[PDB]
Amino acid sequence: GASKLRAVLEKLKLSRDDISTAAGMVKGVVDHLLLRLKCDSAFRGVGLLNTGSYYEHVKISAPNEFDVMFKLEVPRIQLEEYSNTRAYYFVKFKRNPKENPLSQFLEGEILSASKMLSKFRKIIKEEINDIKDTDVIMKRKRAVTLLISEKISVDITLALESKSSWPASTQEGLRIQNWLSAKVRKQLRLKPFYLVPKHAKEGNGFQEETWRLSFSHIEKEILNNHGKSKTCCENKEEKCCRKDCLKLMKYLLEQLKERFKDKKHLDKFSSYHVKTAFFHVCTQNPQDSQWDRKDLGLCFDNCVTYFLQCLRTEKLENYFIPEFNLFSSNLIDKRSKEFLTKQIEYERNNEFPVFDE
Template sequence: MDPRRGKERRTSKKAGAGTPKGSAQSARGGSEKPEAFSPASGAAISSSGRCSPAGKSVPKKSARDPQKMPPGPGAKTAPLRAGDSPPLGAPSADERERQKAPSVPPEGSEPSASAEPPLPVVRCRRPRGTGSRRGGGADPALERRSAPRPEEVGSPGRESASGWKPRQVLKNLKLSLGDISPAAEVVNRVVDHLLRRFQSSDSEFKGISVLHAGSYYERVKVSVPNEFDVMFTLKVERIQLDEYGNSGAYYFVKFKRNPKGNPLSPFLEEEILSASKMLIKFRQIIKEEIKNIGDTDIVVERKKRGSPAVTLLIRKPKEISVDIILALESKSSWPVSTQEGLAINNWLGAKVRTKLRRQPYYLIPKHAKDGRSFQEETWRLSFSHIEKYILESHGQSKTCCENGGMKCCRKDCLKLMKYLLEQLKKKFEDRKELDKFCSYHVKTAFLHLCTRDPDDSQWLPRDLALCFDNFVTYFLQCLSTQQLKHYFIPGFNLFSSDQIERVNKEFLFRQIEYERNNGFPVFWNEF
């Protein structure tokens, strides 16, 4: 039996071959070149850079109808070669004539799930004090974005260029000490109890330790402290990683040598460390132990398909969700797929990059998607600890946002964007289009944007509204081009068609565009 086939019989639908390199298209992520869909009306496609660490310039584009994106007046198009299909959404000659007639949409109308009327566009400048990505020279071409009403247009440096007040939103989102302390106390007590259980037993997980991760510990949590992420890490030595397909992110794990007495031997299947077996055992121990935690009402939520987390729901005194994730810790060199990732040389510096790449990396039992099924024996790379470090030390200046140091609005922009996605998911919770989008997509886009705009002067607090608008523009571009490269694994595309369907990206694009055109009404739903 080919060990790369893993536990094929465990998959919800048999995945076929064990995907040697070059196969398993669904695991490739970024190996395909996705086709950009036509963005919705009035969308801003920034000229500042694509969704990649390189930050190279791309031609400016103004968006039109979500289903059809005709060339503008005077636009030149290349003739089609024999056998070529016209571009997606390309109009006929008659349609182009009809589209020349002006159309004025009803003000403030909400987008449908399929189309939206065209809106005007306005040119807006980047925040004052910013130059090229290296900090010198003038700002490049002016950028285009969806226009607010004429009376709402402000000048750079004002609270908002479109009438809404981001500072007030952030004030509403600020977590109070009275909310944080009780929630953190309950979570810490539960985590400490589980940790003692794992460390005191003679089980396979005796050497486990805790690594706090996620938005709460990165200090970018928004709204209420009701979700926590905790990694239970287990050191493994002398392991060999066999890449699953050409994903760059998913691997089979083997031991180079398997001496007698290896506590993980019970989880081996034909030399492969079974992710599914370890996760089942890990989950079983947690389910048994939470019964022994007094004064707390806790249940283990039903396992989500393909999820690596064991989710605890603490129901008293307040409802809190805690994702506990098993992770293997390896101190060997990072895999080859990460060599071009973590592009922070022009932002945090080459020395910091070298230092970070000497840190361990982690592997979590995340199943690779294989068509409509999952390969249950794969492990996925995780760099949560590096992401946490970057967010804590986010400035080009070492004293950025410290007492007495220069302030920036990077984390404020991240909080606003996370809250925007969170509120949209809540607004459409009875639909499925936004189910696969998560805060990690927002954080990844944010890290790319910081790479593109590395100077602290490009993130001045007085320019919060414009910096956030740049972030929204950038995220819309990622959706439009269907390209969001993993920050550490550039070959893995988080927005590829097999990760998230195109229709879902179009839906989110239209909703974000509507929010921006109308002053983000979704921000005020709860206040």
């Protein structure tokens, strides 16, 4: 069980130093763009958001690829749920003096996301040309992705920060009461929420004016504070395998994606799908005793088992938005699910050969 798994884990951990050697060139580009971005009136309150695999300590087989996020607060905003999606909204303002920096981006009462990102990419594109230390290139649209020294890639995302209360669609979400207590849940919900630009699927087109809720910052917190016990993983007697199981789940999918990249079945699947399923497993298994380090094998099998159940039943609720099904028949087709299902079941039945691969 754990024998082959922890062996894999040991291998992945060895990619520590290499992920930091390049971060120097990254930290340079990011800091440069932030200065020039603050120059523009609209992107004044722009700032780094310390949420991601970099800060969460969970990055696997993607050392060259980096992911950053730029948050921009929006003091007074009104949100409009789009087509009862429960996860996508419009950005309508409610300020007393209608003179906010985003004025130029408005397309009526609604805030244009397509135009918002246009200026964002526009500034970034113009900024990279300046620096002459390391050759930086902006990748074609297909939101901004940079290529540093032809070896390193950075995915820059723009998020709106609303320190207001979380939308009523999240009310029944984040079921961590029995796991992390109700006191913590109330605390976390007091934290702000973020909005990332993502169009919605429609018959003959997309909706390029919608934003999706983002709670990545909460996810980071929850992962670096995973135990029911406050001293979880702080002593030999209380060491668990929560973080290990997530890392393994992630790596498994990435491998299957890397293996079948040519066909493009798993192209729609993402690490978030795996992270979501994991959080649901944590809720199901609230006790630290259920995540004993000596039970890595058995614990990991549960995750795999649950993830498979989500694929078969085509049901995977957003951990914060219960009515949002990441695995909806419309979002992902049954065939693509049956394929990933088939592959994963094979791996489990053959002591996961995809790991040494």
